[PDB]
Amino acid sequence: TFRLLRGESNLFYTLAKWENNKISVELPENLDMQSPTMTLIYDETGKLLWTQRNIPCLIKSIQPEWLKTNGFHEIETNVDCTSTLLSEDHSAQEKLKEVREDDDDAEMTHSVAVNIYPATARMPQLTIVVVDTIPIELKR
């Protein structure tokens, strides 16, 4: 889980560059866009610097306390938000349709790994957050 999302976090760390008070992430050519993760990068103060996808409901669901340490956490969000997160994913969209019909405020829980990268000569201190886009309720 955490140990598993750590790999994606490390990847995005090595992909990132710090230039002119800004994070830039250049994605590798032909990289899978269909991986079930979304990564966010914050500064040590907890300011969001970069996000793989701009999804405000999920971003607002990230608790600031979490951001100062390494940890494994859970987002408690809604089926509307999860549907926005999984928009491109066809099959998932079918399932999501179903669940939306049974309950329109159905709760969705997403695993999250928070990862700390101390400042180096190359890079300032960063917190990298990796979210499992498939919620616990849909894993089975």
Numbering used by the authors: 48 to 187
What does the paper say about this structure?
PhoQ is the sensor kinase component of the PhoPQ two-component regulatory system that governs the phosphorylated state of the response regulator PhoP. PhoQ exists as a dimer within the inner membrane and has a periplasmic sensor domain (PD) that transduces signals across the inner membrane to the cytoplasmic histidine kinase domain. The PhoQ PD is a member of the PAS-fold and PDC-fold domain families. Unlike other PDC-sensors, which bind small ligands in a defined binding pocket or PhoQ PD homologs found in environmental bacteria, the PhoQ PD from bacteria that primarily interact with animals has no apparent binding pocket due to an occluding structural element: α-helices 4 and 5.
To test this hypothesis, we engineered a PhoQ PD mutant that contains an internal disulfide bond predicted to restrict conformational dynamics between α4 and α5 and the α/β-core. The PhoQW104C-A128C disulfide mutant was designed to inhibit motion between α2 and α4, allowing us to determine whether the dynamics of α4 and α5 play a critical role in activation. As predicted, the PhoQW104C-A128C PD formed an intramolecular disulfide bond between W104C and A128C, covalently linking α2 and α4 (inset). The protomers in the PhoQW104C-A128C PD structure are highly similar to each other, with an average root mean squared deviation (r.m.s.d.) of 0.3. The PhoQW104C-A128C PD is structurally similar to wild type and has increased stability. While the wild-type PhoQ PD unfolded with a Tmapp of 56°C in the presence and absence of TCEP, the PhoQW104C-A128C PD had a significantly increased Tmapp of 75°C. When reduced with TCEP, the PhoQW104C-A128C PD was slightly destabilized relative to the wild type, with a Tmapp 52°C. Therefore, the W104C-A128C disulfide increased the intrinsic stability of the PD at pH 5.5 relative to wild type. A disulfide bond between α-helices 2 and 4 inhibits PhoQ activation by acidic pH and divalent cation limitation, but does not inhibit activation by CAMP. Combined, these results suggest that the mechanism by which the W104C-A128C disulfide bond inhibits PhoQ activation by acidic pH and divalent cation limitation involves a loss of conformational flexibility between α4 and α5 and the α/β-core. In this study, we have shown that activation by acidic pH and divalent cation limitation are separable from CAMP-mediated activation by rigidifying the interaction between α4 and α5 and the α/β-core. The work in this study led to the construction of a specific S. enterica Typhimurium PhoQ mutant that is inhibited for activation by acidic pH or divalent cation limitation. This mutant has wild-type virulence in susceptible and resistant mouse models of systemic infection suggesting that, at least in these models, acidic pH and divalent cation sensing are dispensable for virulence.
